[PDB]
Every structure is written in C-alpha cells, then in structure tokens.
Design a protein around this ligand. Sequence first.
Ligand code: M25
Ligand code: ZN
Length: 258
Amino acid sequence: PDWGYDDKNGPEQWSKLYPIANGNNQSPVDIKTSETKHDTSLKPISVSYNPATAKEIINVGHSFHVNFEDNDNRSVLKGGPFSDSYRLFQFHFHWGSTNEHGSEHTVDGVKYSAELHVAHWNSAKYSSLAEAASKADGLAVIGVLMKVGEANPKLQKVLDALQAIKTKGKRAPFTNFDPSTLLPSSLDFWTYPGSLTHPPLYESVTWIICKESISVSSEQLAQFRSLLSNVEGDNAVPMQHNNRPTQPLKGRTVRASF
Ligand SMILES: CC(=O)NCCc1ccc(S(N)(=O)=O)cc1
Ligand SMILES: [Zn+2]
C-alpha cells in the first residue's frame, strides 16, 4: 500500500495521496469536556449482536480486523443520535509503541494505551458497506478507550487467535463471538461527525465515544505489537503502532449524552 504509520508514509504525509486528510470532518479528535454540549434529544445507545455473525480475523499489515457477516440485521446498533439502524461489520484496535500512548481519541488531552473500534454501516439507507463507506451518514463507529492496568479477560478469544494470523495477509475463521462483551458497563457517550482514521479517510463516520474506559494489561498490548506487518518468509517487522494524531475540530461540536 501507499500509506502506513512510518515516517515517510505516516499520518503526517497522508495528505499528499489523500487530500481529504486536511478536511473539516477528520478523526480522531481531542474531546474537551468543558466544550461538549449536552443534548437531551440523544437517546441511549442500543446494541444487539448475534455471535453467529462472527466470521473471520485478518492481518491487514498495519493492523488486524475481525469481520462479521452483514447480509441481514442480526447484529445492529440503534439509538443514540441515530434514527436508522446500523449493521455491524467489523471491530479492531489501535495501539502505540508504548503504554503512554496508543488511543486515537483523547479526552481533555489525556492519551490512553489503546482504542477499540466497533464499526457499522447504514443498511436503512444503503445496500452495502462499499456504497455506505463514502456517504456522510454511511458509517457509525463506537470507540472505547483502553487504559493500561488489569488484564482484560474478555479479550482472550481475540488474543488467542493472533497466533494464526501473525503475518500480512493471513486470515482465519473467527466464530461465535459477540463484541458487545468488550464494551464498558456504562454506555454514556460523546458523539460528533467525523471520518475514518486512516486512508481512504472518508468523512462518513458518526462517532460514538464511550465515557467509560475498559482495561488492558501491558502484556496484552505486547501481543498486539507482536503481530508482523511483513509477509511470511520476509524479515520480521512488528506492528509497533497504528494510531493517528488528533485532528482540528474545525467548528464541529461534540455532544454529550450525559
Ligand atoms: C475493508 C475494510 O473493512 N476496511 C477498513 C475500513 C475502515 C473501518 C473503520 C475505520 S476507523 N479507524 O475509522 O474506525 C477505518 C477504516
Ligand atoms: Zn479504527
């Protein structure tokens, strides 16, 4: 690919190939609680995922994705700022070179160790992910900040699967899993209109950032960093990091459900 997280092909240089990187609806962003606006029209977040939709886990070079079957509404996200139903299609993480950084979104300047992203697409208005991905109201992603501390047992199935997709391109069956088990006990959230955090960087994402963080141990993060970005047979190249710096709000308003 023509982009990555290294010095020459990283976030700082993405604008060369993808001009939208300097757009007015880019993500992630720094959430300043003193500037958030509480909206009473915001309904509670509602997630209902069917574990049978879990499909496959793939090493995509810069990260790894856990995909779900999205042929029907067995796994959907509703409520919040949405009137339409969004269909689950994938969840993945972002992490940094060390525990002191790793999350993409930050709160009042505080950076966390990693971030969980659960993505969905608008199946009420569109017919496929490919179609919805470029629409302003096409995607919905739940972001959960991960604070380094106690080991998170609910990450077990995911971590145990990494040994089967160590190098770029490898993929394997990942079934019978409900990602709602990874979300925090409280679903209070912040929401704002944004974009995909990496190329193609489409400004088609309605972000749902959870107020409550979930835990993850130093060793579990080490597992993410032990994944290889190279293809099998080549010199090992660890996936040290894949988080984008926060971008200018550009007049956007971050709303709070609490
Ligand atoms: C084919 C496919 O699923 N590609 C990944 C698309 C994609 C999904 C979500 C995000 S994020 N970081 O904004 O949550 C970025 C890219
Ligand atoms: Zn992401």
